[PDB]
Amino acid sequence: DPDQLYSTLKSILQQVKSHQSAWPFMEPVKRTEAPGYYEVIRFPMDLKTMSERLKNRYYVSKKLFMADLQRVFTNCKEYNPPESEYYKCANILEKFFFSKIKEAGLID
Numbered sequence: 412d413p414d415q416l417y418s419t420l421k422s423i424l425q426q427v428k429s430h431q432s433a434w435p436f437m438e439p440v441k442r443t444e445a446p447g448y449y450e451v452i453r454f455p456m457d458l459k460t461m462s463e464r465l466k467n468r469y470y471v472s473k474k475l476f477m478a479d480l481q482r483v484f485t486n487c488k489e490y491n492p493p494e495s496e497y498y499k500c501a502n503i504l505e506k507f508f509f510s511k512i513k514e515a516g517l518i519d
């Protein structure tokens with residue numbers, strides 16, 4: 412079911428967005444926030460871009476959704492020091508994300 416997958420991913424994405432550790436990932440990283448970010452991170456991703464992708468019916472599979480959200484975390488951990496707040500946020504939100512995927516029974 413297409414609309415089943417859509418509904419589930421939308422619920423999950425909205426919960427991830429409302430979480431208090433999501434704030435670093437809500438929109439594209441701004442050049443002024445991180446000058447030369449876009450020279451280091453070749454595949455940028457953020458939750459706004461994911462919202463649009465979802466609305467645009469891009470997430471036809473679990474795999475695609477997971478790949479994008481994971482990219483958000485791996486960009487963060489590649490760019491930032493391990494004890495930075497942004498790195499801490501990524502691991503907290505990743506935990507939350509996995510509980511939500513499991514809670515949904517969302518399998519591939």
Ligand SMILES: NC(=O)c1cccc2c1OCCO2
Pocket residue numbers: 434435436440441444445486487490491497
């Ligand atoms: N998310 C990041 O890795 C990030 C890295 C550097 C600056 C930032 C960032 O997120 C939005 C706020 O400004």
